[PDB]
Amino acid sequence: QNSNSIVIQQLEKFKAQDHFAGDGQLYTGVQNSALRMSLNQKVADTAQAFIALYQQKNEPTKAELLQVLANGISQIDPDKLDTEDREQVATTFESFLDIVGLESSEGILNKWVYGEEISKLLE
Ligand SMILES: [Cl-]
């Protein structure tokens, strides 16, 4: 029940961060301010969903954690972002996996990044 409060502290901090700034290296960040803010909000929404789960459940199951992840990412239309921005969203959501102790996204994150892209390529 102590781990429960820690994860929540991680999520609260994570929720308040800008996840789409330039990393100094090869990622430049989301330039459209309206879009970046809109994206941080979507991330904040998923973070807040996980918090609600841990508040109602001492030890959430892998399946529970995975559904919150899957529902959080499905809220973002991949056809509205460029490749670099989509990759940053995936990296950002990978951090959730580490936080909640979930090993995999069951291929959900890759399908999100390259799904519509490969579909349009084959079309
Ligand atoms: Cl993964």
Q: Rounded distance, CA 26 to CA 84, Å?
A: 10
Q: Which domains does the chain have, with CATH numbers?
A: 1-123 (1.20.1480.40)
Provide the resolution (angstroms): 2.0
CA distances from 77 to 48, 60, 82 (A): 20, 27, 11
| Method by which the model was determined | X-ray
Quote the ligand 1 centre to 57 CA distance (angstroms): 24
Whole-Å CA distances, 35 to 51, 63, 66, 85, 98: 24, 31, 26, 10, 26
Give distance in angstroms: CA of 108 to centre of ligand 1: 8
Integer Cα distance of 75 and 89 in angstroms? 12
**Type of residue found at 76:** I
Nearest to 104 by CA among 58, 59, 69: 69
Q: Do the beta carbons of residue 77 and residue 59 sit within 8 Å?
A: no
Q: For residues 111 and 113, what is the distance between their CA atoms, to the nearest angstrom?
A: 6
Q: How far apart are CA 18 and CA 76, in angstroms?
A: 17
CA pair distance 49, 21, nearest whole angstrom: 23
